[PDB]
Design an enzyme around this catalytic site. Structure first.
Site, PDB file in Angstrom:
ATOM      1  N   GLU B  49       3.456 145.225 168.935  1.00 24.41           N
ATOM      2  CA  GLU B  49       2.094 144.505 169.110  1.00 24.41           C
ATOM      3  C   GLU B  49       1.094 145.538 168.535  1.00 24.41           C
ATOM      4  OE1 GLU B  49       1.837 143.716 173.170  1.00 24.41           O
ATOM      5  OE2 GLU B  49       3.276 141.890 173.380  1.00 24.41           O
ATOM      6  N   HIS B  86       0.776 151.024 179.760  1.00 23.74           N
ATOM      7  CA  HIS B  86       1.084 149.602 180.221  1.00 23.74           C
ATOM      8  C   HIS B  86      -0.380 149.104 180.127  1.00 23.74           C
ATOM      9  CE1 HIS B  86       1.275 146.067 182.782  1.00 23.74           C
ATOM     10  NE2 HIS B  86       2.645 146.105 182.691  1.00 23.74           N
TER      11      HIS B  86
END
Lengths: 87, 87, 87
Positions: B49, B86
């Site tokens: 991504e 994250h």
């Protein structure tokens, strides 16, 4: 902690080989890299030497009796050319 | 095999952390880097991504459920910013 | 097969206690130490966990239902604090 660490393709293959087959060599390489970042190219553990070359800029430090880490340093990064070098 | 592998100081700290704590995570990171080298930034394993915030032109790939590898690519090197990202 | 094994005075007493009273526990402790060395502190047999407190940077692995092995790791050694721990 200050400089980027750049592995050449061959150096990273050397490094991954030791991860699998000789973790003591990985630990020593990591210690040499910390010394280089802290003290510079030529001072610290591993008997640092200028590389026997017709080209300036590269240095080496002893990993064990058979293998030297070969590297160069600038303001941005340590560049590792090999983790298995012997003249 | 083609590109250099560049660890930022934080990324190399993360990588050594996994060397000490979870060697399977080191293997997965190494596999992700091989896929980036062979397939490009957004093609291959680990659900690649784009990173939308806080860094320009970076991407991420899943290491495990809690950690993503954050990196960018040019035709000379993969530069790794983190192995514990994250959102 | 690479890391030194350090026993705290209490951990060696526990270890010798099991040498005399329950060899089954010694066999499991030796297996845990091999797994830590092979896989890293948090991967492998014994359901590895971080130890929340009572020391800094320590881990635990199950020996049997009632007792856990408490240890830390660095580049050089596994350091064992206890072979009888229960929260």
């Amino acid at each position: 902690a200050r400089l980027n660490i750049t592995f050449s393709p061959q150096a990273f293959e050397d490094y991954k080989y030791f991860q699998q087959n000789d973790k003591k060599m990985v630990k020593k390489i990591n210690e040499l890299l910390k010394s280089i970042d802290r003290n510079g190219a030529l001072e610290g553990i591993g008997k640092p030497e200028k590389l026997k070359s017709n080209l300036t800029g590269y240095y080496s430090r002893r990993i064990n009796h058979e293998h030297r880490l070969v590297y160069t340093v600038d303001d941005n990064h340590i560049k590792i050319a090999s983790c298995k070098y012997h003249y």
